[PDB]
Amino acid sequence: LPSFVDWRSKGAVNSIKNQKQCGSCWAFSAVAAVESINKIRTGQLISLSEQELVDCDTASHGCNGGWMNNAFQYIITNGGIDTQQNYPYSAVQGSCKPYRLRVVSINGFQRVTRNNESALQSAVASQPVSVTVEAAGAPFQHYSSGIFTGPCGTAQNHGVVIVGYGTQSGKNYWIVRNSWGQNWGNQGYIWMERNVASSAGLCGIAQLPSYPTKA
């Protein structure tokens, strides 16, 4: 099991995006994970449409929230998802485009053992993983750089993606991709302490991990 993993260095992670004024974190987290597994399996990194999920996943709640697993289920049932180029992000729920295309598809999704950072590390070593984090706190929102150590709660009020992990001067960390643009955190990313005392993980990051599968 690698001691260091960073999917960004393997060309499997897209440029940072911005969800803006829409409660679509669930869609951004799910899409990022899908974009990555597609690259890992097919060799091509394609930017996919978060907007399609906001408009077409009727099991989710548009800009009022949703869940990454709902998103994976939609992509599977729909037979795929369109590109960002053909179905651009508008940050508001609109009509689900009737003639959208199914460019990238997935075969299913796996739910990682809950509240177990070791199990989560194993999953991240294979591909980026979608997770929830408590991100309403001042410490988290004003994060600029370095390894974030809290404080924060465990509410599942935000969805992000873990794109790597490692250790720096004795401190274990997770590399987390946020969807608040490049002007937030460290060029859009946040390094969060890993292997903390609480089984739920820092800010509850280990509570509900899942990732898409593609044979």
UniProtKB/Swiss-Prot annotation:
Its main location: secreted. GO terms for biological process: proteolysis. Laticifer. Active up to 62 degrees Celsius. It is an enzyme of class 3 (hydrolase). SUPFAM superfamilies: Cysteine proteinases. InterPro entries: Papain-like_cys_pep_sf, Pept_asp_AS, Pept_cys_AS, Peptidase_C1A, Peptidase_C1A_C, Peptidase_C1A_papain-like. The active site is at 25, 158, 178. Coiled coil: none annotated. Its EC number is 3.4.22.-. Keywords: Disulfide bond, Hydrolase, Protease, Secreted, Thiol protease. SMART domains: Pept_C1. One of its GO terms (cellular component) is extracellular region. It comes from the Eukaryota. Pfam families: Peptidase_C1. Disulfide bonds join 22-63, 56-96, 152-203. Not glycosylated. It is found in: Secreted. Active from pH 3.0 to 10.5. GO terms for molecular function: cysteine-type peptidase activity. Stable in 8 M urea and 2.5 M GuHCl at neutral pH, in 40% acetonitrile, 70% ethanol and 50% methanol. Unstable in SDS. Cysteine protease. Belongs to the peptidase C1 family. This is Ervatamin-B. It comes from Tabernaemontana divaricata (Crepe jasmine).
